[model samples]
Target: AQRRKEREELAQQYEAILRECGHGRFQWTLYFVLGLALMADGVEVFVVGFVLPSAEKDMCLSDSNKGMLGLIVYLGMMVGAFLWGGLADRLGRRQCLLISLSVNSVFAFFSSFVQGYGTFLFCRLLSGVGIGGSIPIVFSYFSEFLAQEKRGEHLSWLCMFWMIGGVYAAAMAWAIIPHYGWSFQQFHSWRVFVLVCAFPSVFAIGALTTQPESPRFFLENGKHDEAWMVLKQVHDTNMRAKGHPERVFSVTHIKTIHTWYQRWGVRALSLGGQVWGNFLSCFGPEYRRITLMMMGVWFTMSFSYYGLTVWFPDMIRHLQAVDYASAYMVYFVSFLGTLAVLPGNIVSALLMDKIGRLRMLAGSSVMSCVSCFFLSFGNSESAMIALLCLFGGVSIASWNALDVLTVELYPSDKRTTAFGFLNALCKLAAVLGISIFTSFVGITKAAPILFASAALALGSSLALKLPETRGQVLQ
Candidate 1:
């Protein structure tokens, strides 16, 4: 009697719990978190564009100095990325993600109030620290948690969030910049824009709170009991909701899930150890070919993507000039990219299981490289527009795909740091791009420089030596 009643209650509880087992739920949660964080991340990525023009008029920031402001963000990002990767590897994904989210948001909100150029640059750096850490951690965590069959394609597709982030940032810039005017702090509402960028973190924090840590990671660490509980909960919840009786779980399946780790856990690196191991041995015979390959892919893809993206408002300025109306084109096109990113990510997520990551990444990189050169060299308005659209689309999809591939390639403990190292290069490239590429390439010649970035991406990708880490368990 009493026992029967208790069992019934347990069944009900399982049904009530939301399960994230299928690709649908996983992608949804992923997009919400990814989009929100990416949006904030994108703001940091392009925030300078919104204010730099006005800063030029008001503060007369030298072209060189204006470029320095962009570099400042990336410099902080590179260092923060390294630190946060270690923290995430040690602390667990959720904690690090939340910490990354909050720190960036807090800094952004505060950044609005600073008056001096020095103060503004310092604020941007602080925000960059927050943005950099959050980006790779989110990618790592998402890739880590996804179902294996869905892992590769899912990773590529889910990066639609990157595009979404960019678009969201651009939209905000368009909606606010003109009405407010680009002046000091909120006088021009630029500070508000900065703060607005940070606001998305709150949504991310709320969304993430509902998610559980990766079941695989739990089992890898030998937390079998916890792993079983999570697995049973996932299966039982879905089963119960669908009218199947709650299947009593045996410990056997849990044991199987972790068997791989027990055998091959020797390669696992702890946080600090991973950083050193990955950085030092990443280029050796055992790892070098793979390291250089992945690095090439990272550098080329990032250089082109960043170069293309950073040129947006500036490009518009060249083509459209300071039309109160045309300036918003950068903002809107960026937003459209954000909205469009979802489908690409969904496609990537769905197809990755079948097509595999290597082909997808290589192919995507190739296309993106082509698009980069086209955008860089094209002269006519229609040509440039088409090229920008293609560039944004391919670059967003490819980078997201690369992120998933990156996560799968390294051991679990090294995942965060690996991404940190990888993305740091990407961001560092952006810094160089905005400083040198934009300032140097007048509209007429920009396309050729763009083509060069594309070549680097293509050369590096074909030469890449990444191991197929898909479907393998990382410890």
Candidate 2:
């Protein structure tokens, strides 16, 4: 009875505390931090797409090797998602994020200097490790800070930064790569672009150091006093800015009970105990169904998303070659098509709260699936670009919804672990898709589109397995 009372009391206390801190200067500051982190993450993830043609020329790569180029990064990310995600649960959100950002910048910078194909691939893998580590941890951390009442819309808002990263990458590729022509004497244009990509992440990761750890993370680890201290800091900062004192707000006792991993790690770390224990909880009876559904959705999401995107520039080039269009025209269309993603993210952010997550996720995916199928049949360059724009909008929106849903479904203690598993599976599927897509591009122009279409269809269907999460409290 005493234990039950403690648990109940703790739960209530967290809810009260969360409600208080949800709307504040701290929340928006955290948003910008994630925005910077994801923006860098977005650039790193897609820079391969921008650099592929140049990289191919440097190494004399074929379709077979080109496919491997993309696959390796996904492989690194798979390891990273598992590695950093799990570590975030054991360590803390801010610490792991700092590590991820630092490593990402360091390796991406090093990749710029690699002349050998083998060295280049190895460098990309290491950079991908950093990039992959940052994503799931960001998702988990962002979700924890969002207020329950506004979680869906606010979370969706983060995708705008993600879309901006994609558009910025595409724009940079079109504007710089063609003119720069891959190298100046010894230094490569792609290398310069990569170095540029790593720069912002440095600023972003440093920004993380200026902030405190997530209060919820403190509470989860039984650092109640630390959690309260962070909470008071927020109240002090935001409330004072709004013409109120810190004492104007009241603090509550956090009712969270730390697990063995949190309370006494020495015992839990023995025999692979905490690692296994943290992960297994996701498959426990309570979370098993959601886990299966999220993974299923993720498998298809990663497959189609990366498979289609990694080849998008090449697709434009293919059309230019086949139709005998001016080189600049096709590149122009590619640039414009990417711009559609930002508006898509905006529409999703606005509508997720009103229409709810279930419908938004399912409908956007189904719509994008239809767009991908139609892309195979489009005749003119104009028609192709239009369909690409349509796909860009819906596909990005669908992915943002999935990111939000992944965070909402899992409990805090194991949130990063579950996300790590999902993210790894997502990246693995992406590896297969990128490999398969590249290998088959010579077989027919329609092959990759058809493969991507199938994956989108599968994703849209699997999404139905998730319950509507709009307005639901974050677990």
Candidate 3:
């Protein structure tokens, strides 16, 4: 009994030390690496938009074939999301990250060299598999190292990189694609741009491999000594870098869901029962409702967001009264609209801890719904552009809450797996939205927007249904 009490007391000291050592060099270093990885995903995703026209011209592609090229990546993403999430659960986040990065970079590089459309499409599809693993695993890896108070802040900032990537793609396309005089004769500008996109992932791989694995993951996996070593490295690095090098921290690992998982996790999964147990545990009595809730939330969020993003250029072209705008002008408007996303996302990050996650999500949902509604009907070009910015802004902003809630909703043992399922669901939604939008677009421009607005309104009600998670401790 006395030994147990000692363990609990040490746990308290460790927890206090973690909170005090918040936002130190070690944490920020991890954030920087993970953020770059996310930006790679962002760059690759948006870069396709700028490159697709060139690809069509080079390959002599039909409109239907061009559309297929865009979707193959998403289809690969769904499979990667599901497969990599499980791998992270069975293997480790660090391994999954390294493997995903290495493979993704290789495929992206090879894509730049492919002359045949079939081979190019296959390379992109495989590259999507790598990018698909990124979203859930990066979040899972980074969140494990953060103090509860700072987790949401860092996650929100990390999300800002997505916009950064979109801006980078837009700027590069604007600066390079039109300047044929500056292009290398051997390779077109789009091919060069894709080659550039691979560098960041390769760079991220080098940075992350040098860093320590997640201490929480170590503890959960029964590597107690490794967990202690990681924590000591963090503590030493924090104090040395944060002006407290001379100070020493005295603490030990405390038991939580990590220990619980280690105990029952193996026993319940003996022989063939292991996979079944892990699957059902997500729908087990305690987790079923929240799991179902998140699925619904992610589905609608992705459906509307991708629905707009996939058709953004086309929507802008509709604003040209008599004649369609040039492709450059359309992409520029899309860039301006994309710029609006970061401000809203940063605002949510600043206010998330202050206003509470639920309120921010609920309020953003309303704003998004209203913005999409206005976007569907604006008769004037200027009004439509303004509405487009508002809709895009609130849509990605609301995503901040969804991401934070996703990580915190489940315990460490199941967190990545749960998020993986959500990622797959989201990709599934994107695929459906892209298909539906393409089909209805020929009939009426507002058709997709109206459907998206109605989806957002329904999503808003569901956002309110989620439990409030402001200032809640991450398990």
Candidate 4:
């Protein structure tokens, strides 16, 4: 009981210090850096679709092989999410992030040079493993630095970068894939595109190297002095930016309390045992409902989101064939569809704090559901583009809202682990969605779109059961 009281007090004190720090230069810079990491994830995950056409011909891929190519990346992501997220909780968020992004960058670069389909798939799977860790870890890491008031808005801003990454991939594909003049020995345009996609992860790594580890992580681990130093630096940076160079921070020292686990040592359990413990903790009585609901939402959302996204290029290619449109038209439309997410993200950011996380997530998902349902029946070229854009817009809002809620729902210790578990399940859904639905695309395109629509509806309904988390202080 005394230990519980001390933890409560420390949490309150940490919240107070963060409130004084305010949202300033340090947080904004962190936002941009983390946003770049998210963008890299976006490129890594979505670039497979953009490169599929050229790669299909070059590697002589059967339809099954193409589907396996898409599924393999998410399979790797599923493994990465589970491992890295658990490790982030046990090791440290910054350490795991640096390692994961480096793994993603190296494998993605190597993937561009592989000649055989099997070798390429293997590299992409490894890259996906790296990409998987970043999505959940980035949010967990970024939200720790934010005060409650700024957390939702800033996280929404961070989610927008994923959309930007998608647009960047599409634009690069449009520019490079249609041109043959730049081709070299075994280095085709699609290979060049894959190589180019790896650059953002490298840049994100460079930016992350300069940043400090999350102060919240330190405080939770009983390193109060380190937490105080991090907060003080934040306060000083914000003060200097406000032209108050002489202003003093309010908190001089943190009252420390080492919990039983920290005092006795966290290594009491084997590494696997510790990870399994973290996984089980999320399903304990206190967090079970939130964990289950999030799992449902994540599974259905990814089923729809990735199911459609991975097949979008092929859909556009078919449209191009029927209309006798230029080959470049396929990529241009994909770019436009991705660009639609900008407005969706802006609206989500604006309303996230106002309308609240639950409503924004459910509402946007329902909108996407409606759009997808209509898209299944869309026959006209213009109509298909319009509905696809609408789906892109609203679906991204759901993603932004979901990202915020996932980070906000858990305590510091179990946060990343819970997120990783949910994300791993999400990748599983994506794998199943792409493998099952895209196979039906050759027979009936409407079947996949319809399945996606139903999945979105189910996901939004499940989200309604989750508690609203606007303005809640992180535990």
Candidate 5:
């Protein structure tokens, strides 16, 4: 009876959302604001990759050290994801988001001022905490305002915000680093870059300040009236746009907000144990299978994506390629690869009813394996670029398919912790790819091995078994 009620509620909600997304007061505003906000996160997420080339030259750091810095950020990020999300669950998203954004903005600003390598990392870690914490909330918050049918479209565009961030980083690099030279290094252009990524915080905080809290969250917390208002507002906006005299809202209501119980490491275990325990939680069945699956996807994606992106800065600085045109040719190809999968995300958003998450994930992984195999060939620059870009999209699609898919797989109560654990495992694998892989296999061969290993793990896990969450809402 309850499940039947849920379907009826979702149907009405989805119908209302489709109406609003098409035409209504404050429709475009939400889309643009949310897109830009998410774009900032995307930019922040990839800033480290772009900084790799700069790190070697500016900080005079070794290759291994650069990867370690990534590890530091990853560790901080993982911890932050766990802490902030739980904080939001307890204290409320509004407070937690405000504090997290503030920390990100301030620490990012401070990261620009560090005098030594140690200080630099400390500030970065501080910033990392905010970044990690902010990510899950951003996605969760955005999803709250959307309907089930529109999620794929809404989120796909939202995920595209990360691409915007990549472009922003790339544009900044093209404009700033070249004009300033190593003196750009002196102002700590990289640190400045880090700070600037936080520039959106003030605006984000402002928007969330006046914005309605998640209605579902309110409903869950027993603020039934507020949830009714939210549902009413969403529904009325659509009905009003259609020239209706009166607004109608969903009568489906909540009695209590459910928050999952989080198990911390015995309330402060051994120093190393905290990290290890947090890492292992992702792999557990109690939490959710999607956690483990996302971990593997993120881990593999980070490895290959970081490997290529890190190498970009390195290759450009080292003059491994003939010239700028040659280097950018490769870069453009990767960008095109990302654009290619733009469609898959659209498909994902639209097909939740038509297809299962596991099928989408499994197909993408199988597709990725094929793409990786193609990489083993390609002796020349054009061939290499073509193969790399072709597979990169499949790689991104597979990974992104999981990123968006995982959020759906878990309940709100456990979502934050699950995402945090996923982030940690992914980053750990990525840190290895960045820090250790070149050392292990040498730069030339690292991506190939990563591709193969990631494909195997991703494909097998996706194939074997996992719960399929196509149309379940666990708020």
Candidate 6:
């Protein structure tokens, strides 16, 4: 009972310290670094689609092989999300993030140099494993530093980096992959494209090396002094940047708890037990409803988003064949579609704190659903591109809102774990959506688009079921 009171006191003190720190250089720098990490994830995931055609030709990949290559990364991602998320809760967010970024960046670089399909696939799968951990962990890590009022808008801004990463991958592919003369030994343009895609992760790792661990993580683990020091560092950095270096951070001490884990190393069996316990805690009575609802929302969101994106080239081809447009035109149109996320992100950032997460998420999902419905009937090239842009804009807005809502919904301890579980479901949904749509496209192209529309509608409804979390304090 005394310890519980101490915990509450520390929580209150922590909140007060963060409030004093305000959002400034410390948070902005953290945002820029985390944004780079997200951009890396974006490049790694989307670049595969751009590289596939050239890779297929160079590797002489059959249809089945191409399909497997497309799905393997998500499989690796699913496993990585669960493993690293759980581990982050046990270890620390910064540690897991650095390791995961290295794993992703190193494997992605290696994949570019490998000649055989099997070796390349292995590298990609490992890279995906690394990619999976970064997304959920980055959000969890970033949110801990933010005051409640600033959290939503900042998170919305952070999400825009993912879209930027997608555009970067597309633009790089357009510039590099077609240059047949740009080759060294076995390093073709496609290989160089793959190599370049890994650069964001490398740069992200460098940026993150100087960043501090989440103070919340330290406090939750009983290192109160460490947590207080981190907050002081942030306060000093923010004040110094604001040209107020004379002002000292007000908070100096926090109530501490020394748990058993601090004294003894976790045994192998106890580690397994802790993992199981964390998994169960997410679905325990307190969290069960939100957990289930978030799972449904993530599954549907990923299904609809990836299903449409993966099949967009085919949609453009079907619409553009009448004009005999080149494949590059299809890519350029897709790039334009991705570019629409800029306005979507800006709108989401501006309104997310004002109107709240649930409403914003549902509204964007509904807009995306409507766009998808229209896309099914789009015949002309102009109509298809416009609808695609509309879909991209709204869908990314929903994603931004969802990211804020998910991190805000849980306590720091279970936050990344819960997100990891949902993210794994998201990847699974993406794979399923791609497979089902790939098969359906042969029968009728409209069927997949309609199915994606229906999924978005379902997701929007699920979004309404979740509690509004704008400006809420992280537990």
lDDT of 2 by residue, 1-475 (tens): 6854565565456666777754777778888888888888778666655454344335566666665775678788888888888888878899989998888888888888987777888888888898887778887887876667778888888876655676667666666556566567877666666667776689788888898887778877788888888877877777776666635557755555666557566654652466568888789887788888888899988888777765665566677677774534434555676687878888888887788777888998888788877866767667767777787877877887888888877777788888888989988887777767766643576888777878778878889878876655566
Alpha-carbon TM-score of each model against the true structure: 0.79, 0.90, 0.90, 0.92, 0.77, 0.94
| Reference-based lDDT, each prediction | 0.63, 0.75, 0.76, 0.83, 0.59, 0.84
Give model 4 RMSD, 1 decimal: 3.8
CA shift of 164, model 5, Å: 0.9
- As for candidate 3, its clashing pairs are none
Higher-scoring candidate on lDDT, 3 or 4? 4
Candidate 5: tens digits of C-alpha lDDT, residues 9-97: 64355445444434445444555665555655666666654464343236567766766775677677767777776555544565677
2 or 5: which has the higher TM-score? 2
**Pairs that collide, model 4:** none
Q: How many clashes in each candidate?
A: 12, 2, 0, 0, 3, 0
Error of 3 at 372 (Å): 1.4
Instruction: Return the top candidate by lDDT.
Output: 6
Better of 2 and 6 by lDDT: 6
Which 10-residue span in candidate 6 carries the lowest summed lDDT? 48-57
> Model 1 TM-score?
0.79
> Pick by TM-score: which candidate is best?
6
lDDT of 3 by residue, 1-475 (tens): 6744544454354456567555688988888888878888788777554455443235557777787887768888887887777677766898888898888999999998887878888999899898888889999888877776767777888897777777777777777666656556567766766777787799889998898887677766667777777888888888899788887756555443239988776764562254345556889888888888888888998998888776665655655734454447666877888898878987988887778777888899888888776765666667767877888788776899888888878876677778888899998899888778867644686788788888888888888888876555556
* Best-to-worst ranking by lDDT: 6, 4, 3, 2, 1, 5
- Residue pairs with colliding backbones in model 5 are 152-349, 220-256, 220-257
lDDT of 5 at 460: 48
TM-score of 2: 0.90
